[PDB]
Design an enzyme around this catalytic site. Structure first.
Site, PDB file in Angstrom:
ATOM      1  CG  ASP A  69      -2.013   0.998   1.263  1.00 44.61           C
ATOM      2  OD1 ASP A  69      -2.435   1.504   0.194  1.00 44.61           O
ATOM      3  OD2 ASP A  69      -2.492   1.294   2.361  1.00 44.61           O
ATOM      4  CE  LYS A 126      -3.628   4.302   0.661  1.00 47.22           C
ATOM      5  NZ  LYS A 126      -3.995   3.832   2.019  1.00 47.22           N
ATOM      6  CG  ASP A 144       7.719  11.913  -6.620  1.00 50.49           C
ATOM      7  OD1 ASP A 144       7.896  12.792  -7.479  1.00 50.49           O
ATOM      8  OD2 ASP A 144       8.509  11.787  -5.633  1.00 50.49           O
TER       9      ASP A 144
HETATM   10  C1  LIG Z   1      -5.505   3.798   2.288  1.00 48.63           C
HETATM   11  C2  LIG Z   1      -6.400   4.592   1.562  1.00 48.63           C
HETATM   12  C3  LIG Z   1      -7.533   4.989   2.225  1.00 48.63           C
HETATM   13  O1  LIG Z   1      -8.352   5.660   1.526  1.00 48.63           O
HETATM   14  N1  LIG Z   1      -7.793   4.649   3.465  1.00 48.63           N
HETATM   15  C4  LIG Z   1      -6.958   3.892   4.189  1.00 48.63           C
HETATM   16  O2  LIG Z   1      -7.200   3.626   5.362  1.00 48.63           O
HETATM   17  N2  LIG Z   1      -5.778   3.473   3.582  1.00 48.63           N
HETATM   18  C5  LIG Z   1      -4.997   2.506   4.368  1.00 48.63           C
HETATM   19  O3  LIG Z   1      -5.904   1.374   4.647  1.00 48.63           O
HETATM   20  C6  LIG Z   1      -5.688   0.835   5.971  1.00 48.63           C
HETATM   21  C7  LIG Z   1      -6.833   1.196   6.918  1.00 48.63           C
HETATM   22  O4  LIG Z   1      -6.635   0.446   8.086  1.00 48.63           O
HETATM   23  P1  LIG Z   1      -7.656   0.531   9.321  1.00 48.63           P
HETATM   24  O5  LIG Z   1      -8.344   1.909   9.426  1.00 48.63           O
HETATM   25  O6  LIG Z   1      -8.662  -0.517   9.026  1.00 48.63           O
HETATM   26  O7  LIG Z   1      -6.787   0.115  10.432  1.00 48.63           O
HETATM   27  C8  LIG Z   1      -4.494   1.589   6.472  1.00 48.63           C
HETATM   28  O8  LIG Z   1      -3.282   0.766   6.304  1.00 48.63           O
HETATM   29  C9  LIG Z   1      -4.413   2.897   5.706  1.00 48.63           C
HETATM   30  O9  LIG Z   1      -3.082   3.263   5.475  1.00 48.63           O
HETATM   31  C1  LIG Z   2       8.046  16.354  -6.552  1.00 49.36           C
HETATM   32  C2  LIG Z   2       6.867  17.079  -6.772  1.00 49.36           C
HETATM   33  C3  LIG Z   2       6.660  17.730  -8.005  1.00 49.36           C
HETATM   34  O1  LIG Z   2       5.591  18.427  -8.291  1.00 49.36           O
HETATM   35  N1  LIG Z   2       7.594  17.558  -8.966  1.00 49.36           N
HETATM   36  C4  LIG Z   2       8.757  16.910  -8.731  1.00 49.36           C
HETATM   37  O2  LIG Z   2       9.565  16.807  -9.660  1.00 49.36           O
HETATM   38  N2  LIG Z   2       8.949  16.281  -7.552  1.00 49.36           N
HETATM   39  C5  LIG Z   2      10.261  15.661  -7.277  1.00 49.36           C
HETATM   40  O3  LIG Z   2      11.124  16.751  -7.545  1.00 49.36           O
HETATM   41  C6  LIG Z   2      12.350  16.253  -8.234  1.00 49.36           C
HETATM   42  C7  LIG Z   2      12.482  16.760  -9.703  1.00 49.36           C
HETATM   43  O4  LIG Z   2      13.797  16.327 -10.131  1.00 49.36           O
HETATM   44  P1  LIG Z   2      14.273  16.753 -11.623  1.00 49.36           P
HETATM   45  O5  LIG Z   2      13.139  16.697 -12.631  1.00 49.36           O
HETATM   46  O6  LIG Z   2      14.870  18.148 -11.527  1.00 49.36           O
HETATM   47  O7  LIG Z   2      15.349  15.737 -11.942  1.00 49.36           O
HETATM   48  C8  LIG Z   2      12.196  14.740  -8.210  1.00 49.36           C
HETATM   49  O8  LIG Z   2      13.025  14.119  -7.128  1.00 49.36           O
HETATM   50  C9  LIG Z   2      10.671  14.513  -8.158  1.00 49.36           C
HETATM   51  O9  LIG Z   2      10.354  13.312  -7.490  1.00 49.36           O
END
Ligand SMILES: *c1cc(=O)[nH]c(=O)n1[C@@H]1O[C@H](COP(=O)(O)O)[C@@H](O)[C@H]1O
Ligand SMILES: *c1cc(=O)[nH]c(=O)n1[C@@H]1O[C@H](COP(=O)(O)O)[C@@H](O)[C@H]1O
Lengths: 257, 257
Positions: free
Chosen positions: A90, A92, A95
């Protein structure tokens, strides 16, 4: 027209990972994913072994495991093969494509090497899916897109959710479904997995909100419940898992006929 | 009534981490954040030492390091203290509060133990910030909220972006600013940091888009540029860092006076 899990596994457009899952759900009579939200490898593996028969999937957050190693993941794979369940990390992802590619394939976790399924946020645009797919494709992995979230104030609504659906439809070679609170696509080849599930009404103190299996699977048309604390906090995690399993399975059976 | 970085550092409502950053930016005449996107600890540490004098911050993705250890982080902090820059882990948290809390404090990475700054997506709702705050506040940390993204098809626009601004305002004890493409807040206590920066027009193969430092800092009113490949892929990374620093610094001077 509602199809059983077994029938959906044979849909023309179905990804082989989705096929595998649907077949084991049907065989084992489970549409329950354990959210194994623990910090200890020994507890993770003990839960996987004990609950494996009751679940279709085990959802991991490997970045919370204090004693992660790839050898832990090897044993988890062994239990997944034995008991017949998919592993879903998970992560998620949220980036740019070029980054998520490396986060998926690489680092210490090497997530693609052991996770059948991962998920991604759609906020970055379709690039996020493209980057994951360059890794996941040959490895016969699949991806879920986060169309909705369970938490209070979620911005994953309206046009955002609709974009999630479009992005899935457009990358159906790799995207096998959704994290969502309900049915968001009418295409039966798509899986709907729903977190924020508990038997009791409530939430937590950090924005999490809970709906019951009956509401989520029965009324809202989701496929699979994702359950963490509802089970993990129980004295007897096996008993609690079975409780959730039967709830979700019967809600599914009632929708079919 | 635009203030210098030095003056902003002294604002009554300034967060300590922002204040520390603002001061060193003025001292060193740098508003450049190196995105240290590399897979080896040696390379992370070598870039940090070589480019430390030219940068106000070093942005990490620890989950792409093939040989991460807490020792590698200990050393990075040494270099950070020596050369005077902050450590920013671009973890892009995007989960419920309960989960992000553990991802921030725990696991193998123990991010909160070494990162002055982290960032979070606002999609889960304010719970994501409440969860992180619980760890971040006692550890004297700051967080940036992702109000806009640089990538093609980004959904972090309009009302979403506004939602991010409101969330930051309401969590000013922990939130010190934004990841954004332009100024999104009129409050001068908030930082704006912009990735998607190169001197030349273009992008990558996976949805990244580039704008120039003059454009981002000068016309769009951001404070700091985040630059990865524009520096790292150059033959001479020191000269490259210096070009970007001088571009971003000049652009800042002009907007100011
Ligand atoms: C991910 C997306 C989301 O919309 N809601 C979430 O809760 N999660 C992940 O699912 C698990 C929920 O666990 P619990 O509330 O039943 O303990 C959790 O791992 C969260 O990161
Ligand atoms: C994070 C958020 C966003 O909106 N855009 C991004 O590029 N990033 C992170 O920034 C870095 C961009 O690196 P570069 O394109 O200059 O090589 C990167 O680490 C990306 O994950």
């Amino acid at each position: 027209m509602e199809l059983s899990f077994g029938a959906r596994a044979e849909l023309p457009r179905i990804h082989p990972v989705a096929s595998k899952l649907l077949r084991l759900m049907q065989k084992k009579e489970t549409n329950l994913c354990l959210s194994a939200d623990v910090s200890l490898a020994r507890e993770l593996l003990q839960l996987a072994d004990a609950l494996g028969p009751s679940i279709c999937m085990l959802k991991t957050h490997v970045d919370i495991l204090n004693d992660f190693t790839l050898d832990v993941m090897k044993e988890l794979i062994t239990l997944a093969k034995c008991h017949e369940f998919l592993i879903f990390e998970d992560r998620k992802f949220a980036d740019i494509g070029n980054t998520v590619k490396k986060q998926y394939e690489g680092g210490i976790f090497k997530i693609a090497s052991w996770a059948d399924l991962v998920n991604a946020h759609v906020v970055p645009g379709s690039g996020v899916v493209k980057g994951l797919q360059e890794v996941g494709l040959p490895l016969h992995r699949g991806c879920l897109l986060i169309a909705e979230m369970s938490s209070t104030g979620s911005l994953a609504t309206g046009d955002y959710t609709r974009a999630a659906v479009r992005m899935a439809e457009e990358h159906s070679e790799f995207v096998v479904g959704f994290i969502s609170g309900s049915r968001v696509s009418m295409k039966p080849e798509f899986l709907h997995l729903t977190p924020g599930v508990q038997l009791e009404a409530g939430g937590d103190n950090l924005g999490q909100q809970y709906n019951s299996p009956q509401e989520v699977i029965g009324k809202r048309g989701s496929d699979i419940i994702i359950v963490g604390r509802g089970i993990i906090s129980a004295a007897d995690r096996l008993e609690a898992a079975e409780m959730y399993r039967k709830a979700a399975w019967e809600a599914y059976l009632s929708r079919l006929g």
